[PDB]
Amino acid sequence: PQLPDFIQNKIDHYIENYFNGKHLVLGKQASPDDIILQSNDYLALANHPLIKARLAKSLLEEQQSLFMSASFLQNDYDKPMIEKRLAKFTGFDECLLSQSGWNANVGLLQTICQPNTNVYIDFFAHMSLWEGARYANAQAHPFMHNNCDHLRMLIQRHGPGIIVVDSIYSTLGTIAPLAELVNISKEFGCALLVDESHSLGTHGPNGAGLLAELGLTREVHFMTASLAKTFAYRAGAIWCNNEVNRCVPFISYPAIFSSTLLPYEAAGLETTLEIIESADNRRQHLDRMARKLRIGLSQLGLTIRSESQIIGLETGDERNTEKVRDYLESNGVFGSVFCRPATSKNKNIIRLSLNSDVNDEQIAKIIEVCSDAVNYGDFYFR
Amino acid sequence: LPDFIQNKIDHYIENYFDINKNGKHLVLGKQASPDDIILQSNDYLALANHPLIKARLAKSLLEIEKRLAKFTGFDECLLSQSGWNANVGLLQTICQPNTNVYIDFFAHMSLWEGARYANAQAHPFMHNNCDHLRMLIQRHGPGIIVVDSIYSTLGTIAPLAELVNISKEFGCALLVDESHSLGTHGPNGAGLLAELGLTREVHFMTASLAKTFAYRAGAIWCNNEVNRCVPFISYPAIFSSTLLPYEAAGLETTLEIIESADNRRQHLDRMARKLRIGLSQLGLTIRSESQIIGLETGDERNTEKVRDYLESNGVFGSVFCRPATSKNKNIIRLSLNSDVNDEQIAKIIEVCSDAVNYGDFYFR
Ligand SMILES: Cc1ncc(COP(=O)(O)O)c(C=O)c1O
Ligand SMILES: Cc1ncc(COP(=O)(O)O)c(C=O)c1O
Numbered sequence: 001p002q003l004p005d006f007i008q009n010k011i012d013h014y015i016e017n018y019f020n021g022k023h024l025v026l027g028k029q030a031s032p033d034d035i036i037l038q039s040n041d042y043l044a045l046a047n048h049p050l051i052k053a054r055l056a057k058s059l060l061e062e063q064q065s066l067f068m069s070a071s072f073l074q075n076d077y078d079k080p081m082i083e084k085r086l087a088k089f090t091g092f093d094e095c096l097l098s099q100s101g102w103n104a105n106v107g108l109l110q111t112i113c114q115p116n117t118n119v120y121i122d123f124f125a126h127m128s129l130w131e132g133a134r135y136a137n138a139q140a141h142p143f144m145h146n147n148c149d150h151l152r153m154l155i156q157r158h159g160p161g162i163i164v165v166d167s168i169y170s171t172l173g174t175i176a177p178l179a180e181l182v183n184i185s186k187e188f189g190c191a192l193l194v195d196e197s198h199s200l201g202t203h204g205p206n207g208a209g210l211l212a213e214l215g216l217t218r219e220v221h222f223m224t225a226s227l228a229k230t231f232a233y234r235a236g237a238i239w240c241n242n243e244v245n246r247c248v249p250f251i252s253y254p255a256i257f258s259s260t261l262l263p264y265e266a267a268g269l270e271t272t273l274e275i276i277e278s279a280d281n282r283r284q285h286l287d288r289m290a291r292k293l294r295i296g297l298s299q300l301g302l303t304i305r306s307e308s309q310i311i312g313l314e315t316g317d318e319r320n321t322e323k324v325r326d327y328l329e330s331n332g333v334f335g336s337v338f339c340r341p342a343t344s345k346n347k348n349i350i351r352l353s354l355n356s357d358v359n360d361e362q363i364a365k366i367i368e369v370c371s372d373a374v375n376y377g378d379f380y381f382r
Numbered sequence: 383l384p385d386f387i388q389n390k391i392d393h394y395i396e397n398y399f400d401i402n403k404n405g406k407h408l409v410l411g412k413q414a415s416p417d418d419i420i421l422q423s424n425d426y427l428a429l430a431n432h433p434l435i436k437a438r439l440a441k442s443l444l445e446i447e448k449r450l451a452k453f454t455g456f457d458e459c460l461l462s463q464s465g466w467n468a469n470v471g472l473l474q475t476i477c478q479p480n481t482n483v484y485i486d487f488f489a490h491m492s493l494w495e496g497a498r499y500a501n502a503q504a505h506p507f508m509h510n511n512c513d514h515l516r517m518l519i520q521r522h523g524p525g526i527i528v529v530d531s532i533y534s535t536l537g538t539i540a541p542l543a544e545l546v547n548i549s550k551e552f553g554c555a556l557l558v559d560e561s562h563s564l565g566t567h568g569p570n571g572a573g574l575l576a577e578l579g580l581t582r583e584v585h586f587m588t589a590s591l592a593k594t595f596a597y598r599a600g601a602i603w604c605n606n607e608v609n610r611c612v613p614f615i616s617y618p619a620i621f622s623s624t625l626l627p628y629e630a631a632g633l634e635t636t637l638e639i640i641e642s643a644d645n646r647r648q649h650l651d652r653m654a655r656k657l658r659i660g661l662s663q664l665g666l667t668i669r670s671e672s673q674i675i676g677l678e679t680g681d682e683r684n685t686e687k688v689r690d691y692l693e694s695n696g697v698f699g700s701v702f703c704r705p706a707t708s709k710n711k712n713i714i715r716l717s718l719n720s721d722v723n724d725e726q727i728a729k730i731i732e733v734c735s736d737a738v739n740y741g742d743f744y745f746r
Pocket of ligand 2: 100101102103105126128166170195197198225226227228234235236621622623
């Protein structure tokens with residue numbers, strides 16, 4: 001057929017302005033011996049034999065034609081035991097499964113927001129959190145990253161609202177000042193929403209997360225997480241210390257108008273949970289390696305804001321980012337490009353995601369290859 | 383928690399749970415038995431528990447875009463985590479804040495939300511009403527016409543050939559959501575566009591893969607270059623994790639089974655017609671022309687009584703109420719699948735006959 005001008009032109013303009021000939025996030029194919037640091041599989045559970053075996057197992061013997069929205073399966077007898085188990089693991093009263101972390105955030109915010117509702121959101125909070133509030137026509141008030149003072153001032157000005165943060169930030173790998181945020185939430189009669197996508201499983205007792213580690217669990221209204229990180233699965237979940245998960249399934253558009261996880265998917269998650277709560281060994285190893293890399297990189301003078309297994313190289317503009325990218329990939333390092341719309345146009349990041357399979361030798365190489373880039377150079381860092 | 387949330391939640395529980403006789407949301411009925419008649423699943427060719435498909439999935443989990451594009455006749459196919467995501471991402475890619483989107487009143491909520499997320503200018507046209515559409519485009523300019531090939535609640539069929547002509551006449555792009563026709567309709571299940579010989583004049587087609595394909599995913603088909611751009615523009619495509627590679631393998635087997643399921647299609651097509659005719663002659667309005675039959679039950683209170691009646695007598699039954707429908711135009715949807723029996727069909731007709739009427743409630 002023939003696309004209307006009002007589309008062809010958008011396509012043409014985009015291709016010319018965004019597409020080395022490929023989109024910035026696409027570099028060169030990597031070799032087996034290269035060090036790949038792109039997966040959110042922090043405990044390297046992707047290929048765990050017990051998980052795969054249990055998925056395969058339940059996947060046999062279905063009824064189980066439950067192709068319909070989860071809203072129709074909110075009777076007790078239809079709700080997966082993995083919800084109760086995730087709730088107990090985490091310390092929250094209730095858990096609700098979602099089709100993704102994105103959906104968990106959009107759905108939860110739709111359930112708890114009115115168009116008038118004040119939403120105080122960290123400037124670096126995940127896009128799903130920005131979008132959920134926007135979809136709800138909430139009044140978003142962003143505060144400077146991890147800046148509690150600014151937050152305080154904002155709430156002073158606009159009144160009670162929902163405070164929304166990532167526990168660990170997906171781009172920069174920094175950690176929210178969660179204890180202070182709980183105090184502020186109490187000081188002003190707000191509700192707190194913490195996205196633990198990058199801390200659930202890697203942090204806390206048995207990996208119960210950062211809120212459990214700091215003993216804040218009972219003090220927080222809501223917690224969300226993609227289960228597609230440490231849990232290594234395409235789903236999400238909403239935890240509530242209240243009765244909000246009773247309503248979400250009937251209010252959230254993604255919960256209502258998109259199909260639910262199949263029963264066998266939940267069964268896998270149960271086994272994943274068990275493996276995760278026993279994985280003290282990989283947690284420790286991952287914590288230690290990330291610190292080594294952090295320290296390694298902070299010497300050298302690089303801006304390394306991280307306090308976690310996520311490390312962001314701040315590489316300025318797209319041109320300069322391409323250059324860094326090519327340089328790291330030319331050596332053994334990959335390497336995930338964060339650019340618009342995820343970042344501001346000239347504040348791009350090449351994220352290094354560590355996992356518990358990375359070893360001492362590999363860190364060293366990464367530091368060395370970064371030391372070379374600084375400043376065998378050819379490009380800059382912010 | 384804080385009043386501004388507590389107040390909202392209390393009101394909601396009061397006006398959506400407490401008012402029903404079981405104290406539950408309206409969609410929540412009684413527990414089915416074997417062998418009550420269950421008509422809720424969207425798995426139209428009853429593939430959910432197919433031996434081969436399960437085998438292929440497990441196999442690949444231990445240890446397709448091209449095929450789907452060829453299957454359907456479109457130039458390109460791009461996979462998505464859901465039909466919802468497919469629609470939302472497609473709309474986000476081709477829309478600008480300015481764009482006219484001409485959308486059938488009953489088109490799936492994902493298309494509505496997709497246009498809205500993109501800040502498009504939505505122009506609702508009355509269900510399957512081409513005159514209304516003609517007027518709106520004359521008034522507002524070129525834009526994207528968006529329809530369900532088969533509508534999710536009513537089971538009506540879009541007037542596709544006439545929409546193709548309208549789009550050509552008025553310089554519009556056309557988006558067809560084939561979620562409820564892909565696999566059940568057309569040559570080897572290629573769908574309604576294919577059945578009608580219209581594939582080559584539609585710009586875009588989308589589909590949940592969670593109906594006939596019995597899988598949690600979606601796809602976007604393009605007769606142009608858009609699928610090259612969707613992956614770097616759509617928020618669901620950017621900020622939400624992808625399908626794992628073994629998931630795609632399952633779809634390949636599924637596709638093969640669907641391609642060969644001429645038998646199941648035919649039986650389903652026949653059962654649906656038998657039901658449509660049986661229910662119509664009772665004087666219920668039955669707009670459907672497919673395996674989706676909408677019992678029109680008016681208001682929530684009446685709907686509750688209708689569904690309690692049906693379930694009490696072995697028929698289930700998916701309630702569609704706000705926000706899926708108007709407050710006063712609820713539907714109890716019967717979704718047929720290829721496993722459904724003649725005897726079961728007669729049984730449904732019988733139960734609705736007694737229903738129309740034991741008194742107690744009405745149908746529209
Ligand atoms: C017409 C239509 N499009 C899209 C969807 C959503 O598809 P999915 O459940 O894969 O998100 C549905 C919902 O059932 C639908 O009926
Ligand atoms: C903090 C945070 N929340 C939510 C998400 C979305 O998770 P999902 O891919 O399961 O939709 C992500 C990124 O994927 C994230 O980094």
